[PDB]
C-alpha cells in the first residue's frame, strides 16, 4: 500500500499473511509438494522518487518469514530476502537495475507461472536466468524507445555468485530477451548463457563449461481469459538429485514445456487448470528421465483485492519406478490470504 | 499505528523498542530470569478489510528481534516471528482463522499474563494450547451468533508438528473455550487434547499417548482496578527439564495457580502484586517437584500511550535444594518502552 | 519518511536499498574488501511522542538484510539489528538512553567515517566505546543546558556482555565526549574505559585487565568544503587476527590517524580523497604491524535526498608480508542507492 507521496517520492509497504495447508498421503516424502502446515508472510517495500520530468529513481526489497517454524531453534528455517535491488529509469531511454532480482529467462516463465499455489516448477531460485538471482545487472527498454507501444526487450549480464554449495553458485554469464504484447496478446523469447564454477564441474551430474537456458511464451490475457504456453529447453542448467546415490547436480538436458488456462468470473472465481512437464536427457547413469509431470485443477476466490481463498489440486503423473526418486503422490493445497 | 485506510481496508503497522535490563546476583545462572541487557523490539502489521456489509477479511504478523545480540554469530539468537494468520469474520456466524496464533487455552491464562515485564509463567510458546502455537485453525464466536451479549466461545484444531525437538512438536489435537464478560467482571473455562509425537514419547521425562491443559480463570477488570485469577491442570504437555541428568521431557501432571492485583492511578502509575505456583507431580526419578513459586512486586509508569517506564521484582520462592535444580535466587527487570 | 504524525505521536519509517558491488583481484582474499556483489537493504523505525511541552519520548530500531545471499542455507548471513534503544529528553536538563546503541567515543570517530563506501576503519562493532554495542546507557547535553550553543557532552555507562566470543565481549565501562563547534569549525574529543572479561584475557593476544580508547577531532564544514581529521590511541581494545592461523585477540596498543576531504557540488557530485593508517604495537611475537593504511579517491553523485551513485576506490598500502597476513590488495566499490 502506498503509505507516503510528497516532494517527488513515493514508497510502497506491501506484504501478506497466507494461512496455508497442504495435504499427500502419508508424511509426504514421496509427493509433489509435502504436507503439514505451510504457512508465511511476506514484507516489502518499492519506492520512486522523481528526479526530474524525465528521470526516476527506484530500490525494492522484499522479504519471506516463514509462519511454520517454532520460536525455537528452527525460528529462520526457510526465511529470506527475495529481491533487493535499486535502479534509473528514462522516459524513453530505458532502466538499469543491479542486486538480486528476477534473471532475464523469466521474463518468458513468468507466463505460466499463474496457478494457486503450485506451478511455475522451472523457475528455480538462484539458478542462473531463470528465477530470482543475486548480483544481476539489468538494461530493460519498453515500447522500443517510444517507437513501438508492446515491443519490449532486456539484456543481462549476471556477475558470478561464488558459493558454499554447486546448486546455488554461478560464473559470469549474460541474457536477454524480447517480447511483444498488445491488446491481450503477448509472444516472448529470451535467451541466457553463462560460465559454470569448478564447484558445479566437481559434481557428479552435469558436465560442461558452460550453462544455458531458453524459453518461449505465448498467451492471451484479456476479457477475463488467461492462457498461456512456454516451451524451453536448458543445458547443465536444471539442478536434480539422485535419491538412490544420494548425490546432486545439474541436468545435461532438459525440455520443458508448461500450460495453463484460467477464467476469471466476474463474483470473483477463478477457475484454474494447467499441464507441466519437464524431463532430462543424458543425466549419467540413467538418460532419460522425468521431473516434473501433473496435471493441475484449482481456483482462487477473491472477496476483494485484499482477501482470498484457493484449493490447488496436483494430479501428479510421476511414476513409482521414477529414476531419480521425484515423488510420485499428488498434493493439494488450501490457503487463505490477507494483503495489501 | 494506523498508516493506511482507504477504499474498505485499513491497514496498522506496530512495533516497539525496549531497553530492558535483568539484575540478580552471581551471573544469573541460578535465577529466576537471570541478568544483564535483554533489551529487545518488536514488529508487525495488522490488517483488516471491508468485503461487504456482514464480512471482513484480516491477517497479522509479528516479529521479535532481540537487541541483545552482537552483529556477530550470535546475531540472530531469540528472534523469530510470533504470529501470522490469516481469517475471515462473518455477521453473527463467527470468525474463523488459520496459521501461527495463540492455543485456546491461553483464552484463560491470558487473564493472569499482565505483569510489567514476568509472569504468565505457564503460557509456553510451541506447547500445545497454551501459547503460540503454529497450524492451529481457530473458530470463534461471539455473543452466541448475537442471541447472548458477552457469550463466547471457540474451537479450535490443532494440526501435527512433527518437529527436530520434542519440546517444540506436537501431535494432531482438538481444544475449545467458553468464556462470559459483561461489565468488567469475567469468566472463564478453556480445554484442549492431543496426541504427542515418537519423538516426544521417547523423551525419559513425561509418558503416555496423550496431552491435555485445561485452566479457569476469573477477574475484575474496570474502574482503575485488576483483579484475577486463574487455576489450571496439565498432563504430559508441561517441559521441564532436570539440569541433574541434563535430562528434557515433559511432566506427568502440573497444577498451576496464578493470581494478579494491580491499580492504576489517574496520574499514570499502576503497581502491580501476584502469586504464582506450577507444580508437577510424578515426576520420573523425583515425584513432586515444584516448577514455579515465587510472589512478585511491581510497578508501571505511564507518560502516556506511547512512552512508558517499569519495574518488576521477583521474590523467588523456589529452594535451593530444588529437585530439578530449578534457579532459586531473585530477579529485578527494569525497562524502558517505547511504542507506536 | 514520516508515516505517522497525530496526537503527539510521530514515526518514521525508513530504510535503503544498496546495488553494491567489489571489485578486487583474484578471489578478493587478500584485499581490503573483498569482491563480488555486496548488495544490501536496510529497514528501520524512529518515534518520537510529546508527553508535555519539555517532555520527549523516543525510540529506535533498525536492521540490515544482505541482498548477495542466496535463498538457500546461506540466507541469514550479515544479517543483524544494528541499533534498538528507547529514551527519554527533557528541556535543557538533558536525554537519557538505554539499549544498542552507539559508543560515545564514536562521536569523535564520526568527523572521518564520511567515504562513499569505505573507511571508518577503526569505528567496530561490539568493541566497548568505538561502535555500535549493546547494553550502554546514554545521557547526552545539547548547548551546555542551554547556555552556550555549540557545546556538546555524553556521557556513558556500558555495562558487560560476557559473549561465546572475546572479540565480541565487554566488561563493565565508563566513558564520555564532549565537543564545541563555531562557524564551520569543529573540535572534538571522547574517551572510555572498561574491564576486559576472562575470556577476552584468556586470548594469546592482548594483555591487561583495562581496555581503553580515547579519539580527537578536527574538522571544517561549511560553504560545500568538508575536511577532518581524527587522532587516536587504544589500549588492549582493538581487535587483531592472524589470518592463516588460529591466533586471535586484541592489540596491546595502536595509534590511530584518519583524514578525510571532500567537496559537495551544488550540481551534486561530491569527490572525496582520504587517509587513514591505523598501526599496532606491542603485539606479542610481532612488535609493530599495519593493520590498516591507504589513501582513498571516490565520488558520489546525488541526484536527490533519495537517490544517490557512487564510486570509492582503495589503494591500498599495506605490504603482501604483513605479519598477521592482513590483505594488501586494492578493493573499488560501485554502488547504486535508493532511499526513504
Ligand atoms: C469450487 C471449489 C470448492 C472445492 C473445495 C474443496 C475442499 C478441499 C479439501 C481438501 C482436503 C484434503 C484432502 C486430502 C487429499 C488426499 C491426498 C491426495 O491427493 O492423494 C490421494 C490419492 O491421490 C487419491 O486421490
Ligand atoms: C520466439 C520469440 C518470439 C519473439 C517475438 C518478438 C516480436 C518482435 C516484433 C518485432 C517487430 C514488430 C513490429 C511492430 C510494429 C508496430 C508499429 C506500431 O508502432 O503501431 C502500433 C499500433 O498502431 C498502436 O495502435
Ligand atoms: C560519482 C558518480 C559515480 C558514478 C558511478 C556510476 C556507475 C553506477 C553503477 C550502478 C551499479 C553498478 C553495479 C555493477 C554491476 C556489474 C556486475 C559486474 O561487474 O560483474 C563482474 C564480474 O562478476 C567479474 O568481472
Ligand atoms: C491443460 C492445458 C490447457 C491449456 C491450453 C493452452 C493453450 C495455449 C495457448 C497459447 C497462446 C494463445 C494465443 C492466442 C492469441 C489470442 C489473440 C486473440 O484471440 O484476440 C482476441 C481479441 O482480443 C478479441 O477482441
Ligand atoms: C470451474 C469449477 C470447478 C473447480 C475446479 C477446481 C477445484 C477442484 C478441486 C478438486 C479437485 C479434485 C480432483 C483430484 C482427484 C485426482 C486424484 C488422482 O487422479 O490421482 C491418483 C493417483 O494416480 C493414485 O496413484
Ligand atoms: C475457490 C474456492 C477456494 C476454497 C478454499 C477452501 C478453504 C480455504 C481456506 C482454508 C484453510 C484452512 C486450512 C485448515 C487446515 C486444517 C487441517 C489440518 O490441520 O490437518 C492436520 C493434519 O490432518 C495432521 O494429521
Ligand atoms: C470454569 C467455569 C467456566 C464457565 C464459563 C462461563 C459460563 C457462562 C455461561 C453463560 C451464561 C449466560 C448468562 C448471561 C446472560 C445474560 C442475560 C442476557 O441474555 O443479556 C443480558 C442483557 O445484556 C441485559 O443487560
Ligand atoms: C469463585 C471465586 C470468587 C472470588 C471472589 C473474590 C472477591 C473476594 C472478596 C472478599 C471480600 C469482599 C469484600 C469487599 C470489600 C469492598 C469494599 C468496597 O468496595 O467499598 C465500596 C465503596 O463504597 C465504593 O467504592
Ligand atoms: C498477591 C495478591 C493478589 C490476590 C488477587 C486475588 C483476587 C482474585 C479475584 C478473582 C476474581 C475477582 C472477582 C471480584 C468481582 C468484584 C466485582 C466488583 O468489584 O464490582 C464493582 C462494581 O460493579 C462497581 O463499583
Ligand atoms: C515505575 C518506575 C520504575 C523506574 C524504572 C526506571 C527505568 C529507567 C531506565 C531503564 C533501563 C536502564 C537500565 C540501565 C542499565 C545499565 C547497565 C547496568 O545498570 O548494569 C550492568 C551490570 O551492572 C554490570 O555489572
Ligand atoms: C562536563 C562533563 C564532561 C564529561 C565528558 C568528558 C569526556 C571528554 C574527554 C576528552 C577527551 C579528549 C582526549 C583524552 C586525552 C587522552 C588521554 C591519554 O592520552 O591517555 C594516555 C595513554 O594512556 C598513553 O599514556
Ligand atoms: C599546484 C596547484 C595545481 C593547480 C590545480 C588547479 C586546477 C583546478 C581544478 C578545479 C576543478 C574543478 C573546479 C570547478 C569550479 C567550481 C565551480 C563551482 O563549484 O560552483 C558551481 C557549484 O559549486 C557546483 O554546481
Ligand atoms: C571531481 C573534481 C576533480 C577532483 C579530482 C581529484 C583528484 C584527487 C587526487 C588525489 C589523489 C591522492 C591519491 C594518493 C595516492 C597515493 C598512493 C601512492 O602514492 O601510490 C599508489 C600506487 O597506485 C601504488 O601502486
Ligand atoms: C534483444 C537482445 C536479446 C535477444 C534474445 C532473444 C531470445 C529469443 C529466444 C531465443 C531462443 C534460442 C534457441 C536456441
Ligand atoms: C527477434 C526474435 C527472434 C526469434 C528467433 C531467434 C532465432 C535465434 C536462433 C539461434 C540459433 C543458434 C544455433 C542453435
Ligand atoms: C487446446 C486447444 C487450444 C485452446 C485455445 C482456445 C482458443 C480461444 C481463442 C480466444 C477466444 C477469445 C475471444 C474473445
Ligand atoms: C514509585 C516506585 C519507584 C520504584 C523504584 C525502583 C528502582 C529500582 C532500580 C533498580 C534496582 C537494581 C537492584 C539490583
Ligand atoms: C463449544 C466448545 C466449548 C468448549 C469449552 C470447554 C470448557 C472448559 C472448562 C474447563 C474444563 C476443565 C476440565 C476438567
Ligand atoms: C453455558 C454453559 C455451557 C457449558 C458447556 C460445557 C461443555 C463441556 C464439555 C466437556 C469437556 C470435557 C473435557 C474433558
Ligand atoms: C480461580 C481461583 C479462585 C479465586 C480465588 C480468589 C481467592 C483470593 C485469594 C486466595 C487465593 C488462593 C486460592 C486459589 C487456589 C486455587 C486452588 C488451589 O490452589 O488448589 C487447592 C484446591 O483445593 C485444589 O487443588
Ligand atoms: C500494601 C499492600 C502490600 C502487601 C501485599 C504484598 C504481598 C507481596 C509480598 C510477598 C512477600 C514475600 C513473602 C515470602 C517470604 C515472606
Ligand atoms: C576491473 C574492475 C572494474 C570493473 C567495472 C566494470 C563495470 C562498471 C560498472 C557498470 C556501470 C554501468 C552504468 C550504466
Ligand atoms: C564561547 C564558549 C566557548 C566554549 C569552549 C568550550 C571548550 C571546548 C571543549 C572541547 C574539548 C576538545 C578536546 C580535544
Ligand atoms: C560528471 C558527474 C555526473 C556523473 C553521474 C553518473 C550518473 C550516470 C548517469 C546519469 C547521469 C545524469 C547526471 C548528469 C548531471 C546532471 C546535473 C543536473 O542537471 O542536476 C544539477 C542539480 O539538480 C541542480 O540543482
Ligand atoms: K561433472
Ligand atoms: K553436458
Ligand atoms: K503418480
Ligand atoms: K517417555
Ligand atoms: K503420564
Ligand atoms: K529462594
Ligand atoms: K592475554
Ligand atoms: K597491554
Ligand atoms: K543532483
Ligand atoms: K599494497
Chains 1, 2, 3 share one sequence.
Do not use: C
Request: net charge negative.
Amino acid at each position: 500500500a502506498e503509505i507516503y507521496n510528497k516532494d517527488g517520492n513515493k514508497v510502497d509497504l506491501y506484504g501478506k499473511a497466507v494461512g496455508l495447508h497442504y495435504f499427500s498421503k502419508g508424511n509426504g516424502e514421496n509427493s509433489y509438494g509435502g504436507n503439514g502446515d505451510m504457512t508465511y508472510a511476506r514484507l516489502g517495500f518499492k519506492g520512486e522518487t522523481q528526479i526530474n520530468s524525465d528521470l526516476t529513481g527506484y530500490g525494492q526489497w522484499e522479504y519471506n518469514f516463514q509462519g511454520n517454524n517454532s520460536e525455537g531453534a528452527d525460528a529462520q528455517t526457510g526465511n529470506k530476502t527475495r529481491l533487493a535491488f535499486a535502479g534509473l529509469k528514462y522516459a524513453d531511454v530505458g532502466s538499469f537495475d543491479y542486486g538480486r532480482n528476477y534473471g532475464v529467462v523469466y521474463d518468458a516463465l513468468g507466463y505460466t507461472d499463474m496457478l494457486p499455489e503450485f506451478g511455475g516448477d522451472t523457475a528455480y531460485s538462484d539458478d542462473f536466468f531463470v528465477g530470482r538471482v543475486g548480483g544481476v545487472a539489468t538494461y530493460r527498454n519498453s515500447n522500443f524507445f517510444g517507437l513501438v507501444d508492446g515491443l519490449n526487450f532486456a539484456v543481462q549480464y549476471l556477475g558470478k555468485n561464488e558459493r558454499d554449495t554447486a546448486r546455488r553458485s554461478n560464473g559470469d554469464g549474460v541474457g536477454g530477451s524480447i517480447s511483444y504484447e498488445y491488446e491481450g496478446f503477448g509472444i516472448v523469447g529470451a535467451y541466457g548463457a553463462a560460465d559454470r564454477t569448478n564447484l558445479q564441474e566437481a559434481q557428479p551430474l552435469g558436465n560442461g563449461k558452460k550453462a544455458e537456458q531458453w524459453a518461449t511464451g505465448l498467451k492471451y490475457d484479456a476479457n477475463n481469459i488467461y492462457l498461456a504456453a512456454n516451451y524451453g529447453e536448458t543445458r547443465n542448467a536444471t539442478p536434480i538429485t539422485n535419491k538412490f546415490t544420494n548425490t546432486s547436480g545439474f541436468a545435461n538436458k532438459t525440455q520443458d514445456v508448461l500450460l495453463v488456462a484460467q477464467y476469471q468470473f466476474d463474483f470473483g472465481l477463478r477457475p484454474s487448470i494447467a499441464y507441466t512437464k519437464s524431463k532430462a536427457k543424458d543425466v549419467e547413469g540413467i538418460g532419460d528421465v522425468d521431473l516434473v509431470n501433473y496435471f493441475e485443477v484449482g481456483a482462487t476466490y477473491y472477496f476483494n483485492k485484499n482477501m482470498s481463498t484457493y484449493v490447488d489440486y496436483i494430479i501428479n503423473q510421476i511414476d513409482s519406478d521414477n529414476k531419480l526418486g521425484v515423488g510420485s503422490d499428488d498434493t493439494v493445497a488450501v490457503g487463505i490470504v490477507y494483503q495489501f
